[PDB]
A paper describes a structure:
The N-terminal OB domain of the RPA70 subunit (RPA70N) is a major protein-protein interaction element for RPA and binds to more than 20 partner proteins. The RPA70N domain adopts an OB fold with a five-stranded anti-parallel beta-barrel but has very weak ssDNA affinity. Its primary role is to mediate protein–protein interaction with its basic and hydrophobic groove and a side pocket, as first shown by a series of studies of RPA70N interacting with p53.
In the structure of RPA70N–BLMp1, BLMp1 also adopts a kinked conformation and bridges two RPA70N molecules. However, one major difference is that BLMp1 binds to RPA70N in the reverse direction when compared to BLMp2, HelB or DNA2. The N-terminal part of BLMp1 forms a one-turn helix followed by a γ turn. BLM W154 inserts into a hydrophobic pocket formed by RPA70N V93, I95, M57, I33 and the aliphatic part of R43, and stacks with M57. The C-terminal part of BLMp1 adopts an extended conformation, with F160 anchored in the side pocket of a nearby RPA70Nb. The RPA70Nb residues R43b, R31b also interact with the BLM D158 side chain and with main chain oxygen atoms of D159 and M157. The KD of the BLMp1–RPA70N complex, as determined by ITC, is around 16.7 μM, similar to that of the corresponding BLMp2 complex. Mutation of BLM F160 to alanine greatly reduced the affinity between BLMp1 and RPA70N, resulting in a KD of around 85 μM. The way that BLMp1 bridges two RPA70N molecules is analogous to the role of the p53 peptide.
Author numbering:
A (entry chain B): 147 to 160
B (entry chain A): 0 to 36, 38 to 121
Write the structure that this text describes.
């Protein structure tokens, strides 16, 4: 999915 | 033909070669806000006339182009700066940082040609 902003960036995601 | 206005092949080049030096001319097919919950973020379905690809996000600095309806579905634009990032699972995303609207949506009026979804796996 790319439908939420978190989907676009894994390394900022904890 | 109308597709003579678009950079045929640029989508595969963006996703496969990743050379950020090209300045491809692409058509916006659709624009959708991304769930944010804050500054809104916009996802774009783009076409080079051969392929469509929905893995484009506008840099937030370009949000006024969408919100003031200067960048809208069917318009033709030239990408002047973009970056490609690769996610943990291998998917690639494109952030559009600078672009120029060459022809407004109203002046183009329709999806150009018959582009098919890009095969990324």
């Amino acid at each position: 999915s790319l439908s939420t902003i978190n989907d676009w960036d894994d390394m900022d995601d904890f | 033909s109308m597709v003579g206005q678009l950079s045929e092949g640029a989508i595969a080049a963006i996703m496969q070669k990743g050379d950020t030096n090209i300045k491809p001319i692409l058509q916006v097919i659709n624009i959708r806000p991304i769930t944010t919950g804050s500054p809104p973020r916009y996802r774009l379905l783009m076409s080079d006339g051969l392929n469509t690809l929905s893995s484009f996000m506008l840099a937030t600095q370009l949000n006024p182009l969408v919100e003031e309806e200067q960048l809208s579905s069917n318009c033709v634009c030239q990408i002047h700066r973009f970056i490609v990032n690769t996610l943990k699972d291998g998917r690639r995303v494109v952030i559009l940082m600078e672009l120029e609207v060459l022809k407004s949506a109203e002046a183009v009026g329709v999806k150009i040609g018959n582009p098919v979804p890009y095969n990324e796996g």
